[PDB]
From TrEMBL, chain E:
Entry keyword Isomerase: no
Chief localization: virion
HAMAP family linked to this entry: HSV_SCP_alphahv
Presence of keyword Membrane: no
Lineage summary: Viruses, Duplodnaviria, Heunggongvirae, Peploviricota, Herviviricetes
Gene Ontology terms: biological process: viral process
Family the entry assigns: Belongs to the herpesviridae small capsomere-interacting protein family.
Subunit structure comment from the entry: Interacts with the major capsid protein/MCP.
Record-given protein name: Small capsomere-interacting protein
Subcellular compartments: Virion; Host nucleus
Amino acid sequence: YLGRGAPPLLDNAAAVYLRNAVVAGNRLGPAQPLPVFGCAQVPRRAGMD
Amino acid sequence: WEHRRFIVADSRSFITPEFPRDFYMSPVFNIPRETAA
Amino acid sequence: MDPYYPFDALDVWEHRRFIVADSRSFITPEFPRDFYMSPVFNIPRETAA
Amino acid sequence: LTEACAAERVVRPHQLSPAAQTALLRRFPALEGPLRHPRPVLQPFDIAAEVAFVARIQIACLRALGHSIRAALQGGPRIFQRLRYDFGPHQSEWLGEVTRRFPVLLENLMRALEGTAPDAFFHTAYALAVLAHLGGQLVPLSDDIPARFADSDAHYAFDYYSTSGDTLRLTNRPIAVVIDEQSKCRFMEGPHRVCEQYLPGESYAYLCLGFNRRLCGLVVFPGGFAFTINTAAYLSLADPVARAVGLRFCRGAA
Amino acid sequence: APQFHRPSTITADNVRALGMRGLVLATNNAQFIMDNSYPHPHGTQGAVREFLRGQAAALTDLGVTHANNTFAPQPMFAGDAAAEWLRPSFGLKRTYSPFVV
Amino acid sequence: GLFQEAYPITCASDPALLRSARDGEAHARETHFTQYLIYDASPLKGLSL
Amino acid sequence: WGKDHQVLRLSMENAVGTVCHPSLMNIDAAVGGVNHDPVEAANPYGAYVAAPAGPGADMQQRFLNAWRQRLAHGRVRWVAECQMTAEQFMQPDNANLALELHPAFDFFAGVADVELPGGEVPPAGPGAIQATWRVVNGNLPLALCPVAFRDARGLELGVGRHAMAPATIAAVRGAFEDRSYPAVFYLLQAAIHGNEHVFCALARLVTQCITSYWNNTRCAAFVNDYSLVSYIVTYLGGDLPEECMAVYRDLVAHVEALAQLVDDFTLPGPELGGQAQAELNHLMRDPALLPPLVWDCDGLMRHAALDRHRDCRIDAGGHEPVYAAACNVATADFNRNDGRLLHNTQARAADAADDRPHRPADWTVHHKIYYYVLVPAFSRGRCCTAGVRFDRVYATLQNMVVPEIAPGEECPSDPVTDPAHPLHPANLVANTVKRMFHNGRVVVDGPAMLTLQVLAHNMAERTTALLCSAAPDAGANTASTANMRIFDGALHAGVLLMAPQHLDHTIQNGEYFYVLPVHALFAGADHVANAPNFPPALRDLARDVPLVPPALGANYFSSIRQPVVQHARESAAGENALTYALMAGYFKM
Amino acid sequence: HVFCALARLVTQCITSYWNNTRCAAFVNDYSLVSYIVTYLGGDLPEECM
Amino acid sequence: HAGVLLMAPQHLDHTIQNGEYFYVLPVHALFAGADHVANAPNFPPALRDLARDVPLVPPALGANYFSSIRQPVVQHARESAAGENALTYALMAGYFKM
Amino acid sequence: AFRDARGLELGVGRHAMAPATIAAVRGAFEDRSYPAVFYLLQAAIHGNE
Amino acid sequence: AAPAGPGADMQQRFLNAWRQRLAHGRVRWVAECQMTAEQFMQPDNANLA
């Protein structure tokens, strides 16, 4: 879900449920999702070890 | 190359049909001006 | 029941780059002819009248 | 027209009384059409008057088909061939069936031409090739006609029916194949349908059926064995009947 | 008496007056040769239909001859009782022995 | 990229059966009923990490 | 190990961010890129749906003669039941290797251009390579999912949950596979036909038949109907020894067990596209799929009233359903062709029903548990359906020799001693039903007069081949899977035949019951191969290759395909296993 | 045909032999054993059926 | 006060009206038969499946969080694999205060 | 299992129920055909000895 | 809630009353399908705080 690549579900009630269901809290999960042009802007965790 | 048989194409090659003589006494060969449809 | 033909046969070697005044062939299938079944249009149960 | 037929209990206003006709005509004058025309091309006072306008055209072409099929096939014919397709040696025994298979088709083609709905008939090639000719007695609808169909009479336009099994239509698109004794075939220029890739009459299990702006059509069988039909000698479409037909089925091109 | 080798004879009055004790024997003792010079007005499929209302409505007759035998038909399920406002409508599982000496 | 290859490393399905990796592949438990191990085969085998 | 002396873990919940994108349903370029360079006629037995034509009574002898030609031509696409694993991975012996592309789909050589719910004989010629959709995980072929793997998953779900007793299934399996089986038990089932009111009418018959047949064989009696077994639980469970009664109450409790295994694996989420959470998860919760025996009309009232639903086409006359509230002697027009299904099943025929049902929501789901799962767990391939000549049936149901009792005489009890008993050899003439109480020894007595007054009450015309189709659900319904089809054939007024008995002229071979294999789950290896008048050439194709008459659905256009149905007639693991295993084979994709 | 003609004789012969021995009677001919499984399935004790 | 413990929710029967003598009325999440509540005569068919794994109790009798026994003691009982002997003490130990 | 684990500590030493009283009580709960005369007597006796 | 009305109908008045919001969102305390380390990870336990 980081990138746009596919035709979504036509049952649009279903896919928006599954939208945040996958991208709840991934370290590779964006906030404020995809604009028209540009990167997904993967967030930054507070520390890396 | 390629290998196959060959017959010269001419307009003297006929395939023969037959008729049962009632073929034109069919419901669609003989349609009135208006249908029941 | 054989269709009529004017000539009997020839055998032509055909070079692949040397096709000039081009011609085509006829396609017949691989299965035996008991399978290419009869043209069937049944009368339906209900009619127009 | 309701209450003059409801208080009089006139179930159909051609059974309306002659004073009860003209007194309504003294009130509302646009009703001289549906009450005092000898043969209006649209039927007066019916619900399916536009639908019965269509079904006649479905009928009148089939007789123009059905009495033209008998015309080129009056007696024992000599059809010899019209296309160039060469054989392998055991391929002729396939046509040994086509001798035996033959006469059941021409019923079932015309049965399927009956078997279609007329609403589903107007998407086929013969229902628009006539409109390319009734516009020639104007651009017909949906612009399925190419830019070069109106150039020659050698630009035909085909439909494709299934030979074996069930005799069913195997197209969405009229496939317009330019045809040149003998004459070899050639396509035109150009969401995916199976049978649309071949030449007419090129292979088995295909019946090929093309038509013209001249409305001299072809019935192409596999093996070159084809013949013209003068359906133009059997199309009996009256122009005042046909002028309400074309205007509902033409498009004014810019 | 309905003749079982012509289908143009079976009515509902002719079979309901016949008991089911006697319809066992009359079917196996008939003539094997089906006849086809008098067809049926409801079709031959309608002649089977006219035969089976003749059997089903005759089931009251085989039961009325045994009316000194079984009990009153208890209400098998709820909803079949008059007074509903203080006590419910019972449903009696009819697994008993219907027999009166 | 040149070889179009990919090396497996020390991995298995149980932390139980991962215990026999700290003795080399001499007596490494390959296979219990379903629990499977693949020893390290890589340029990185035997090394510091 | 990480970049330390540190452990790490990769689950399959790890796989959440990859398998769950809406590109799993993105196969637009796949069908296009394979379409050119076409395939020839692959004699499409399982690759074509036929619309129904005529009554169901003769529908075999249509399809027997229609596929008399392109059936002995070649083989079907599946041969891989004989193929071991990695014999598929090797370049020889699998021309269909280049046709297995997606985990969620199928590419197979089907018909070219003829629209599917129509016609009988497709025009064999050029071929097409399109899609269907893989519904549940069990549809993967058995060289990719091993058979032992299916039992591997099954046993380990078996822990922690209720199971059948090991003793009691021996009664059921003996009952299911009993050859000399008293044919009243097929007839008395169609008598009740799922009507609860006819059941509590006839409770003494139901009492004694199970009671009599237990002494012959230590076995259950009537067990091919969930409704009928359900009614035996409540309305009969008093007057029996517990040893007999344990069999039915264990059977329901295991259906109770196998029911709530779905929702332990579910998450609370919103309602969605008309369907619920459970309907999108598992196949047994979706009401668009309906069991092969539907006596009432609860199913299509749920099934056809869906956003998924497209044209449940009942084809003898009119294609679209309109239904009956109640049904009696003059309403069961024993040979008709309209498509009206009967609602004559509930306890209250006085408080009748055409639109508002009586049953819970899990009622048909329980039948979908009992028919699709448990009967294949006892089938091992050997069971098939039956289309009912209720005119022939209701001739001989009400056909008994029960004499009048004398004034002062006793009750009929025993057949061989008492001359007043209906099963006595003095009362035995052929072609009556107490001779059929006598062909298999079932002690049923003089108070059987209570039956016929209610046998005259409710009856059912004849079965019909209902064909409901549907679209892919909300959650799989993208812009390249919108046009896809799932054909789900089932009979309304039909009965299952467990034991095919045809090496016996007691019921002549297909008198009451023409076979009609409604699905590959119920496809008679001994029913259909031993039919009324019959070609011998198909004997090869009958011993394998389940004959599904193509009005009732195809091999690829249903929810349940050939991979699982061989798995039923395979591994000898326990009943507790295969119940959970096939259930685990029913998880949606 | 003659089997069901004498099927009572087949029944009494088996069970009387079943009283003396714990042994099956007519296993010498499968065509007979096909019949007893098919026809006499009611009038036998289950221990020898 | 004058209540009675119903063991088996029997809704596969219209002989007694379903809840004729006894309106169901769940008093706690320990006591919520999934076939008592969902198969009552006046039950919303829009709330079927959410009734199955949630103990619907009207809040005049107590909610989850202000009961002395919360959901985890309930969920142990229906889900644990052990036989009742071990299951006895395993939930009996689930009542020692904090 | 942990909540069941310390039960298996306390399971020793104290009274365990008989095997017969396990299934008899449990089948009575799961008796869908449980006769409802017993419910009304339980309300008839109503704690009154 | 306060104890309202008689006891006969208080559940039946409840299901009409609370039909709206109880289907709106899934409640907090049905997380019994969550496992350990599904919980302690920040996604799939928005209630971790």
